[PDB]
């Protein structure tokens, strides 16, 4: 059973730079290595077979090299289309196996998020549940910390986060943090606050509301 | 011009059966190697099964005895019959042209298979109203909370497709209850709050739920 | 005289598996000693017969088939197997009566640039019958448009080369294979073992 390990897990570069992606095999597979490209929501696409031969229609900036246990995929001048996930696959020994993928991300300048907080709607409150939403809009890099403070008590274990894919036009990310609680518990508290830490902020940003205002 | 279109994915209980189909054109199905490859949500690629040009059949160890690959050349279609389905089988399933059992040079679009004990459920749609305070000459945020649905997917549009700039529809996350929930937001000028109308259109085909929620600044 | 097993096992060059060789053995004394005592074979599997006991049986004819595959594929040279070799190159019947012998030949059949003389059939619309040999090199029409003898889209060369290299892992290295099959026709037996002798 051949295990493929890709490095690095994530790679962040500007358009125009050179990208170098590594695949390492637990055993020799000698030349029986392929590279695929996958954009979000789309199917994988064959880039390279036989470790070095390009598939039909693949631009010249994609090249593959290596053998045995070490393989490399190089993109010479990164175009925007090229920012995607890349998978190595071996076919030297059954069963064929893939690597876990390398994600190629667009690098840009730091952008601080804009922060918004949303109290639960009254319609939702009438069904017995309260969801408080915090929105971090159009920031970079992707690392951010969102902290819920209810009546100045740090809340833990009852919130979930979701992060968009990198935006096509400004290359930023957006994030939603949702705090869920019962109607009774929601009416047990007064001040609801979202506290955001991000590299683009010299100090954490807090958005707050008082219940019933 | 090779084309592959998969169909048949949907919600199924553990132990149930499904048949996925792949409609192919641009080559002779009976003459080629063909494979099924699957991708669990947020995970990598796993080869599932292969049919040789001469008809021989091979399977990954995790599906041996439960899955069966087959083809019909007059219909130009490849089939995957899945029986005794397990939760681990949840994935997007891809149909693929296979060059000599080596690599996959043509892929379909994929079909989502969800294996779960959870029942189909339509979402509740709640507004995320634009803030009282926002900023007189600045930008405001509003959106729709799409909560407690199953299975995937939902589609969200704003103003029947007219509003697309500044829209972020977040990926669905599975809650403790085993149901999905999701928010779609958009940033707009605060001036526009009193002159433009904002309506989120939510559709959930697995439950035949369709909702049009107007999002309005809330009474103070 | 003695049966010419040596010129099969010790041949300078072997055939490619798609064009496997077959030697018809007749009207000789076969002493299988040479084989089963020699600790030189990584594979010596016999079906419906034992090597110890061959030396006292008689047959109308014996067939010795020989070719080169990679070690990975030696398992496919057996009754009831499937795979590219079994399906499109060399097929044993389910009621096979005989022996399958193989040994690593990296020291003879690998080259530093890669040995592209040994080939195998990759594409075929249907599986071979037992002991069928297909040496066609016709362009494989994978689609509806005829290939007219030119490789291209949906038009594949049916054969592929192994490219044996001495650096390869042992699963990818060339293995020489000899398959002995024994046929009992309604006819006099011409291939037997030895025994005592007068004068
Ligand atoms: C091939 O030659 C070697 C050495 O000359 C010998 O030991 C071996 O028996 C020969 N093979 C056969 C089948 O006799």
Numbering used by the authors:
A (entry chain L): 1 to 213
B (entry chain H): 1 to 82, 82A, 82B, 82C, 83 to 100, 100A, 101 to 216
C (entry chain A): 334 to 532
Quote the passages of the study that discuss this structure, keeping the authors' original sentences:
The spike (S) protein is the major surface antigen of SARS-CoV-2. The S protein uses its receptor-binding domain (RBD) to engage the host receptor angiotensin I converting enzyme 2 (ACE2) for viral entry.
We determined four complex crystal structures, CC12.1/RBD, CC12.3/RBD, CC12.1/RBD/CR3022, and CC12.3/RBD/CR3022, at resolutions of 3.20, 2.33, 2.70, and 2.90 Å, respectively. CC12.1 and CC12.3 were previously isolated from a SARS-CoV-2–infected patient and were shown to be specific for the RBD. Among 17 ACE2-binding residues on RBD, 15 and 16 are within the epitopes of CC12.1 and B38, respectively, and 11 are in the epitope of CC12.3. For example, whereas CDR H3 of CC12.1 interacts with RBD Y453 through a hydrogen bond, CDR H3 of CC12.3 and B38 do not form such a bond.
